[PDB]
Amino acid sequence: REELNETNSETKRKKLTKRIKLLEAFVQSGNKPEWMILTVLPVLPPDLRPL
Amino acid sequence: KSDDVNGRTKMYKNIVDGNHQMEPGMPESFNVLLKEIRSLGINIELED
Amino acid sequence: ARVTVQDAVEKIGNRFDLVLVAARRARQMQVGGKDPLVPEENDKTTVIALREIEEGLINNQILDVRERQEQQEQ
Amino acid sequence: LPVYQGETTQTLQDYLMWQVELTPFTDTDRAIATSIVDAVDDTGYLTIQIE
């Protein structure tokens, strides 16, 4: 936010506001960022994939 | 006329008995889609 | 069978509430406990209810009044 | 093709209930009925004693 408020340019106005929106969406939603790298993998029921 | 399992039998019963009443419930395909989405690392559920 | 449905439309106007009133009337007529106020002509409850509505006797008010009167009379 | 054919079949016991549904009866009669025709073989006589 400080970098976007202080420094202003043609290429600085973009590629930074989207990052701020991404940080806000990751903070307000509660979802941890480390949750993007999954540890356990879920697998479908067997009835949704018959023999 | 769809994949709703708990509705087809009830509609057949109402037509044989002459009631002409519909109970929608929920299609099974939506549950299949929910399970297939939950098969990945993306949580999804329906609130109240 | 009823060819065109226009009188009931003029009695309702909204063209949407007419279907709901006719359905809530035909449901009762089919399940029982009611009597067709219009003399039937070997027709099903749907057309009977629709013609009774187009005649100017069944709407979204008289039905509610009758239901409230029947519930209070219990 | 995901489901290939996957034609759900009749199954006898399944056939028995389809007529259970359109037989007329009470909740207690429909409860015992599910119990009875629950306990019935491929051959068709019942497995458990009536008592």
UniProtKB/TrEMBL annotation, chain D:
The domain of life is Bacteria
Region forming the signal peptide: none
Please report which protein family the annotation says this sequence is part of. Belongs to the sigma-54 factor family.
Summarizing the function annotation, the protein's role is: Sigma factors are initiation factors that promote the attachment of RNA polymerase to specific initiation sites and are then released.
Q: What is this protein called?
A: RNA polymerase sigma-54 factor
| Residue numbers of the full-length protein present here | 109 to 159 of 477
